[PDB]
């Protein structure tokens, strides 16, 4: 379903959504089983929580001691679970006429906590729940408009021995260099040396950990300068697709600070933080 097609009819039903993660709150402890201790006889009992309500006892459950209202909650002995709140923004494609994309809040508990990072495309299955909002802190009064959110039950972020036996077969091929150089950029024609140079950058040198000095890194830097119409930008895009991480920065569209890192402040936490530039 689309984020703009959820109606009241579809409340309390299992739906499937896809979107982009925008922001996630830190871990929130959610109580599961409460712990009570009698102030008089030092008797301890555990009571369950139903619908966010503690089934507190009126008086001590022991027979000899029955002092009413003498039970107290020991905060640090109650069982707890994990809770987290995420904000999901619909994919840019779904936007009908170029407006601000809508967002829907999600809740994930236990294992699914810290499963999706900020700025990732995920597909989430959960229950489309509804819940009241209290008009003010100090009253049971409720607003007539209900808040909508999704109770997530599954999240999907959108080597075998057989493969290893297969991979080891290619390495035996005598013309492996040509095969890989021809497969890295199928479309580009008669640039075998350029392709070979590009390929060796993906593999990279060898890493060395080195005390009594500094680390030595096997990273290769390549410059492709030549006449305009030749396939330079095409190879740039082709390699940009293959690599797992990379930023397609251009000329005059990037800044000195923008490449390295930007100093900023976090509004939510009100602390000085720094972002990661294109190079970082």
């Amino acid at each position: 379903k689309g984020m703009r097609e959820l109606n009241p009819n579809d409340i309390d039903k299992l739906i499937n959504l896809k979107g982009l993660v925008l922001r996630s709150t830190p871990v929130i402890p959610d109580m599961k089983v409460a712990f009570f201790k009698c102030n008089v006889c030092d008797h301890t009992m555990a009571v369950e929580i139903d619908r966010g309500v503690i089934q507190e006892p009126a008086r001590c459950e022991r027979i000899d001691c029955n002092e009413p209202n003498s039970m107290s909650l020991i905060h640090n002995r109650c069982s707890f679970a994990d809770k987290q709140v995420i904000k999901l923004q619909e994919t840019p494609d779904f936007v009908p006429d170029g407006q601000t994309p809508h967002s829907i809040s999600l809740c994930v508990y236990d294992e699914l906590v810290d499963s999706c990072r900020a700025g990732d495309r995920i597909e989430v299955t959960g229950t489309f729940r509804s819940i009241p909002i209290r008009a003010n802190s100090r009253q049971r009064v409720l607003k007539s408009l209900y808040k909508t959110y999704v109770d997530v039950v599954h999240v999907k972020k959108v080597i075998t021995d057989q493969d290893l036996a297969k991979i080891r077969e290619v390495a035996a091929r005598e013309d492996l260099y040509s095969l890989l150089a021809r497969s890295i950029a199928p479309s580009i024609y008669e640039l075998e040396d350029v392709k070979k140079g590009i390929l060796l950058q993906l593999f990279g040198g060898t890493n060395k950990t080195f005390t009594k000095g500094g680390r030595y890194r096997g990273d290769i830097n390549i410059l492709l300068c030549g006449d305009p119409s030749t396939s330079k930008s095409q190879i740039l895009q082709y390699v940009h697709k293959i690599t797992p991480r990379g930023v397609y920065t251009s000329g005059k569209g990037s800044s000195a600070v923008g490449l390295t890192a930007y100093i900023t402040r976090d509004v939510d936490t009100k602390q000085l933080v720094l972002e990661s530039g294109a190079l970082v």
């Binding site: 920065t249 251009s250 005059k252 990037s254 923008g258």
Partner: peptide, 27 residues
């Protein structure tokens, strides 16, 4: 200006504008 004089090449060649300035590293 100079900025557009240089950045119009991106749009003309590849249909996308790429900016990696202070806080925004999107295209």
């Amino acid at each position: 200006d100079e900025s557009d004089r240089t950045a119009i090449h991106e749009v003309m060649e590849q249909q996308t504008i790429s900016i990696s300035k202070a806080g925004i590293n999107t295209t």
